[PDB]
Write an enzyme that holds these catalytic residues in place. Sequence first.
Site, mmCIF file in Angstrom:
data_model
loop_
_atom_site.group_PDB
_atom_site.id
_atom_site.type_symbol
_atom_site.label_atom_id
_atom_site.label_comp_id
_atom_site.label_asym_id
_atom_site.label_seq_id
_atom_site.Cartn_x
_atom_site.Cartn_y
_atom_site.Cartn_z
ATOM 1 N N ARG A 1 -39.128 54.469 -16.316
ATOM 2 C CA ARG A 1 -39.251 56.172 -15.587
ATOM 3 C C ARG A 1 -39.523 56.997 -16.485
ATOM 4 O O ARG A 1 -40.005 58.039 -16.366
ATOM 5 C CB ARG A 1 -37.599 56.165 -15.661
ATOM 6 C CG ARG A 1 -37.274 57.884 -14.200
ATOM 7 C CD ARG A 1 -36.899 58.610 -15.690
ATOM 8 N NE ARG A 1 -35.810 58.645 -16.413
ATOM 9 C CZ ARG A 1 -36.267 58.833 -18.360
ATOM 10 N NH1 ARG A 1 -37.007 59.301 -18.140
ATOM 11 N NH2 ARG A 1 -34.630 58.267 -18.722
ATOM 12 N N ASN B 1 -37.898 66.053 -37.675
ATOM 13 C CA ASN B 1 -36.562 66.610 -38.301
ATOM 14 C C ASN B 1 -36.700 68.315 -38.453
ATOM 15 O O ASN B 1 -37.166 69.102 -37.837
ATOM 16 C CB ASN B 1 -35.597 66.476 -39.184
ATOM 17 C CG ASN B 1 -36.182 65.455 -40.790
ATOM 18 O OD1 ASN B 1 -37.401 66.170 -41.025
ATOM 19 N ND2 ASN B 1 -35.595 64.929 -41.361
ATOM 20 N N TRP C 1 -42.651 61.046 -31.769
ATOM 21 C CA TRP C 1 -41.763 60.135 -30.211
ATOM 22 C C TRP C 1 -42.441 60.573 -29.736
ATOM 23 O O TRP C 1 -41.741 61.280 -28.034
ATOM 24 C CB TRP C 1 -40.039 60.703 -30.214
ATOM 25 C CG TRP C 1 -39.286 60.198 -31.903
ATOM 26 C CD1 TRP C 1 -39.322 60.788 -32.885
ATOM 27 C CD2 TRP C 1 -39.503 59.000 -32.043
ATOM 28 N NE1 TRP C 1 -38.247 59.934 -33.405
ATOM 29 C CE2 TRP C 1 -38.930 58.462 -33.651
ATOM 30 C CE3 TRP C 1 -39.467 57.765 -31.542
ATOM 31 C CZ2 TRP C 1 -38.357 57.693 -33.833
ATOM 32 C CZ3 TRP C 1 -39.152 56.300 -31.774
ATOM 33 C CH2 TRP C 1 -38.504 56.366 -33.187
ATOM 34 N N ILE C 2 -43.847 60.659 -28.857
ATOM 35 C CA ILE C 2 -44.296 60.978 -27.836
ATOM 36 C C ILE C 2 -44.752 59.945 -27.080
ATOM 37 O O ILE C 2 -45.089 59.087 -27.640
ATOM 38 C CB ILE C 2 -45.756 62.144 -28.314
ATOM 39 C CG1 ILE C 2 -45.374 62.705 -29.295
ATOM 40 C CG2 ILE C 2 -46.014 62.468 -26.734
ATOM 41 C CD1 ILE C 2 -44.055 64.065 -29.129
ATOM 42 N N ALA D 1 -38.050 68.279 -15.987
ATOM 43 C CA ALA D 1 -38.075 66.527 -16.336
ATOM 44 C C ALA D 1 -36.466 66.159 -16.913
ATOM 45 O O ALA D 1 -35.952 64.875 -16.329
ATOM 46 C CB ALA D 1 -38.376 65.924 -17.452
ATOM 47 N N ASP E 1 -18.901 45.720 -21.094
ATOM 48 C CA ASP E 1 -17.758 44.734 -22.079
ATOM 49 C C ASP E 1 -16.849 43.827 -20.610
ATOM 50 O O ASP E 1 -16.130 43.744 -21.542
ATOM 51 C CB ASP E 1 -16.742 45.872 -22.043
ATOM 52 C CG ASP E 1 -17.116 46.621 -23.699
ATOM 53 O OD1 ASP E 1 -16.809 48.033 -23.321
ATOM 54 O OD2 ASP E 1 -18.278 46.190 -23.907
ATOM 55 N N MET E 2 -17.771 43.567 -20.046
ATOM 56 C CA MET E 2 -16.952 42.675 -18.734
ATOM 57 C C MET E 2 -17.457 40.885 -19.109
ATOM 58 O O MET E 2 -17.366 40.224 -18.606
ATOM 59 C CB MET E 2 -17.275 43.347 -17.715
ATOM 60 C CG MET E 2 -16.299 44.325 -16.942
ATOM 61 S SD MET E 2 -16.879 45.103 -16.007
ATOM 62 C CE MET E 2 -16.221 44.094 -13.797
ATOM 63 N N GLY F 1 -19.658 37.709 -20.278
ATOM 64 C CA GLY F 1 -19.325 36.856 -21.615
ATOM 65 C C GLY F 1 -20.680 35.911 -22.043
ATOM 66 O O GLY F 1 -21.270 35.893 -22.390
ATOM 67 N N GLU G 1 -31.812 64.789 -26.826
ATOM 68 C CA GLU G 1 -32.111 65.962 -26.494
ATOM 69 C C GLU G 1 -30.859 66.391 -27.771
ATOM 70 O O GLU G 1 -30.521 67.384 -27.814
ATOM 71 C CB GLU G 1 -31.494 66.382 -25.129
ATOM 72 C CG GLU G 1 -32.598 66.514 -24.818
ATOM 73 C CD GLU G 1 -32.389 67.276 -23.279
ATOM 74 O OE1 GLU G 1 -33.417 68.333 -23.392
ATOM 75 O OE2 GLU G 1 -31.555 67.071 -22.158
#
Lengths: 375, 383, 382, 380
Positions: free
Chosen positions: A94, A139, A161-162, A242, A336-337, A339, A356
Amino acid sequence: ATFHWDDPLLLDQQLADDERMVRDAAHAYAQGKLAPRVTEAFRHETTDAAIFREMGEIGLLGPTIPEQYGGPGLDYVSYGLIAREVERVDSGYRSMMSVQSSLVMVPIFEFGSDAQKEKYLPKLATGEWIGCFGLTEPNGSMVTRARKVPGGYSLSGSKMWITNSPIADVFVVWAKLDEDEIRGFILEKGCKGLSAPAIHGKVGLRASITGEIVLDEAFVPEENILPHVKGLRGPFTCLNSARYGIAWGALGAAESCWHIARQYVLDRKQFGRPLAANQLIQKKLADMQTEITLGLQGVLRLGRMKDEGTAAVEITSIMKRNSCGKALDIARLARDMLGFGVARHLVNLEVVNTYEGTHDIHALILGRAQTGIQA
Amino acid sequence: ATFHWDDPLLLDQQLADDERMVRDAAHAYAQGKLAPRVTEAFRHETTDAAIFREMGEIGLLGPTIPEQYGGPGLDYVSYGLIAREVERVDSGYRSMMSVQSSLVMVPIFEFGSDAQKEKYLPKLATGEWIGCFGLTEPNPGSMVTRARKVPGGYSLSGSKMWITNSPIADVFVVWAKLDEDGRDEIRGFILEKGCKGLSAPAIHGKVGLRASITGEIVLDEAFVPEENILPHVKGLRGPFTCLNSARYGIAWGALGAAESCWHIARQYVLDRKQFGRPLAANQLIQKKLADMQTEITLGLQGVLRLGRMKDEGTAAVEITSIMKRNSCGKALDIARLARDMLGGNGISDEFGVARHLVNLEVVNTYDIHALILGRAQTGIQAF
Amino acid sequence: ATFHWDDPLLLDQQLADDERMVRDAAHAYAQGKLAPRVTEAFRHETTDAAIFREMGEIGLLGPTIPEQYGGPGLDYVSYGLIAREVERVDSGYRSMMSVQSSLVMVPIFEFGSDAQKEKYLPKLATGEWIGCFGLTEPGSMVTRARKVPGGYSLSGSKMWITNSPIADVFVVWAKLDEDGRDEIRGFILEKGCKGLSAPAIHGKVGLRASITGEIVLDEAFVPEENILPHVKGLRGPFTCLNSARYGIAWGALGAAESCWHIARQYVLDRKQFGRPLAANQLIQKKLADMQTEITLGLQGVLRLGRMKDEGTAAVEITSIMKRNSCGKALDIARLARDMLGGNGDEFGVARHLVNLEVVNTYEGTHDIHALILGRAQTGIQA
Amino acid sequence: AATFHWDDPLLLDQQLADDERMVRDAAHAYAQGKLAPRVTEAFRHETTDAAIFREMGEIGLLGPTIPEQYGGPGLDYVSYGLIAREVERVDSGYRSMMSVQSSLVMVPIFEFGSDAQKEKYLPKLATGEWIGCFGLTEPPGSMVTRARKVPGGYSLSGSKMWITNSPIADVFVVWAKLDDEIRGFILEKGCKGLSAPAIHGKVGLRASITGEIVLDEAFVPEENILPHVKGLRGPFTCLNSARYGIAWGALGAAESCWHIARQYVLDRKQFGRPLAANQLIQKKLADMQTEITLGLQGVLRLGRMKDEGTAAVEITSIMKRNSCGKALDIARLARDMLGGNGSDEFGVARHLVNLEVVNTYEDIHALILGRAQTGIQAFF
Ligand SMILES: OCc1cc(F)cc(F)c1
């Protein structure tokens, strides 16, 4: 009066027919082409640019772009349905698509010159050219800067991070310039001082390729700066578009999680009985259904509001915060359901939810809008 | 395009002028007549029977009931809107109204004879007659109130507990087992105030819903004519059809209560100061208002859509479970969130929240809907 | 080896026998004398002063105060066990006793002259004299002591002072000017001397069973011999609060046990679909969460108490236990309220619930204990 | 005023006996020294290593409660826990390998085995020379895998799935029905009929190897049946022992996630300050420290009780559920404090996926605790 567990509010019945085939298009594509690829692709972080060619062939890139420029001239609800269906396979797919649509195509269409719209949109629309978006640095107050030079800009900076960058033909990059205004620049692959090294070893979004854009005195001609935008408004129009698309998409990931978990519990047994016989399991399922059902209503309504021009940008904050938050909760509940396609959806959404930042930027846009007072 | 923090998705613009009018009218009545009453009514558990005629004469009782029988013959979305404006003030008043409409007038209009319908509905509509619903016992299918056959009709013994309106009721819809053609099934019987062997003592010192009168129905061989039995319904379907109607109204009403606690919470953070800066400037405070706005906005899209579907006859009964469970659960979360935002201890008007809170803790008990949903999703019962 | 569902980690057996008898004395007293009063007292916001003599009689007021001043000379673990037993009935009552022990007797004991000690503690210890404590107002406090002929003039207003409308002895913290420098000092005041007011607060949402008021100082005169001499600045108020918090940490866990027990007995007793509610899996998870949180919360206050008796407990530990005990009692009361039908006797739960909502918000809505703890972890004031 | 240790608020260290503290440091020096440097590549490529058994054997960290008599280090339950916690501090896969040896292999040989079996298997299990596995799960149930009498022993047939250690294990403790009660048998590698196929591509616990125990008329000699146990008591005692170690270990993992999140908000700045200065980050940090501090007291108290013989089986349900569930919450909370995607801090992403699996082996404890409280069973 018949009950549909998987579509309680009969969303099907609330879509135009036009809208319903866009959705099925996206559905047949995602299931026929992306589902068989996704497992090994995620697992090995494999670069496949075939998605662009393929999606471009069937008219799913730049959905809101007019036919005049090679787009399919669809509405926002259709954009949403498209993203939902692709994220139903994987967030990384996506992501690639919302980069083309909302982060590259939209700024060119909205902010670009006639000549830029004609040169880039059509080939972007078909996915012959792949695009990327450089705003994020290591950063919205960047250090990446453009200065004027003989005909007429020189760019130095770093964007981290492109997504798509290592395979992109076209680059929409944001930098500061004065006469200090944030501006958008169009760079092309193989251009002097421009490189885009890939990033490997990601925890989530491993099915998308990500890199940086490293600009070392990169030369952009005059004819390549976006004429009709200065300042925050440029990047923001892109992110707003976006985040709308991610709000439908996150729900697709969540639906997958719900279905997988539901099916798992029907098929496996404990103490001579399916897990589904368990109340605790029924409660969890009830919450997945509910959150997804409501979320869909919110995004449907926002999409209609965008199309008729009655939607302020702040609504997008409600739907994006909600969609990602609940999709994350649902994935964890589903996990968490068990197994394990779920585990994939889970790390994806872990990345998507914190993309974000970590201070809940949208809770604040919303706090400020209710109160008048900045945090 | 302007942002409306108080109606983000412009619900107001998703309504017919029709329903908008009914909403505004419900709002003017609730704010003009119910708001002034509420603090003392809640603090003192006061009985105000005069409320039914007020609601009735403006057509708030039996929203959906046709004009043939004195109702306003409105759609389900209008009923919702009415429930929401009333609960906005107090769950207890909404309770009064939802009982009249969904639990008294509906079974009668839907299950009763022609004679019953013309006898009862018009007075229930204007509020001349206060009705009540006798289904809950002290300790659904394992019911114990018994109808046995006699000359002239039926004779009922048994007890009902927590029956809203009963001490002031003129009309009683009472569900009792009648063993007939062998077959033991649940039937509905209409009784009238003053009938021998029917008493309705009141219950006092409630924790929640104190603005609404509640009591019992004690049936001691009370005589019911053969023309006071609901002819057109037997078994679970009777009581269920009524509760389903009520849960729809509750699913809208609860969102009104949540809007009040939100609105109160927001105002309080604006007016209060902490470290010089207003409370509104705090990040955690803004998360909480965002969460509150989000859940309310979405819960509304939920109940609006269900409304459209009921008016279209495309809505299955299970959808109501999702909306009732979500409305009540999310509204109870918001009330707790707004309550935890207030320091201090209940003097201030903004402890209107504490009242809404305790109301919502009763409403949330009047899990089972999760089971209805889990079953529908899986085909396996887990009750 | 058997399992005690009501005491999984056998706390009963981690106590010393003298400590258990202290616990059973408080339990006998609370179940005996307070249990019968509580619903009505809460329901109608009564004043009941008689409780102080009652608790003093059997020595539960100021547990850690030495016998030399009329105290029973106990340790911090017994303080807790008592506070737990009283709050088990009602938070309002635990509060009365909290104020007397941590907020009046403790300051006088640690910060007062010998004279102050012999004048005040014995009467507080028996309950003859009832006490309260004025710190919080409607560091940056504004209540003020002017130095005047013979002592001080105190002016300002403290709000939400439990016991104030029936108190004989008042411990007020006001700021005093000293050659330019402004510092927090503690003052003892007595009932009825001109300038002091105790007007009750009415229509409280919770802690209704405990009489609460303001303190109003208009130029109230305090003699020299009534200023607490052996403390100034933060040590005074904080030593007090840090002691009340410790008792609140044990107390809250008592309230939570009530909710738990009541909830458990309610679901064993009620039937649905011809089976007890206790048979449902959703019900059993809630009961398991209650059992867990209480069991763990108890191990924490026990360890805190023992560290306090050994002089090894840092002040920040109290912030862990206070926050956790209260926060988890509130969840449990909510979980228990949500398991009950009907609308008001199993409805002790509603009462505990509203009590715990006040208790959990009493020290502000900014989570002062997380901040204390975050600052202690990171070094950084938020 | 006494000193506050943010990292050990209740001074757990002080509550420990001399030898207990020494074992803790031993396992710490080992885990930090030998396991930490391997974990990132081991987890990444699911890279089996087994020199660990022999490593932990050599410092006497395997089968901690087995007496010196049989080559064990003769230690109490608290020490077992502390070890589990130091290993899991590094990676749940490693603790898992070690939980199988101690609790699921050496414990049943000691409890239910003959003098012969005790003399033969434990000394070499304790040093890590022989590696053990536990075959109970089937693809109990009740279990299908059956044992049959044949001249001088038993022939076993059936299948166990998700057996950790199996494809590398020298010794197999397997549970079968014998005609009709469940019994345990000691199989040795190289026994005919015993196949142990490996399983690849796990999500979590990628540092550990897992496989199957396919049994096909496998022959066990008479002297290899556990003579002192029949029925559920056999398997359950093993599980109940492993859960106790898992209860401590999960808190070790929770500690790492907590410390990593903590250090991360110290290092990163936002809006001109460290993230550690945000009110909401402080709340999260407080929760992490609270739940860890309290859980540590619970498993410590459970340790003292098991040592003194006063601890019922149900208490283990309390701790294991609490430890695993709170650990997972903490790893989710830390994970959500991290922006970026794949450096040091994403040690958190590893611990989370481990804890996701660890948590998912058994809610069933919610129901064990519900039944002990209500007398009513709700498992089925
Ligand atoms: O019991 C009233 C109270 C609660 C609290 F949290 C602190 C305090 F000092 C007094």
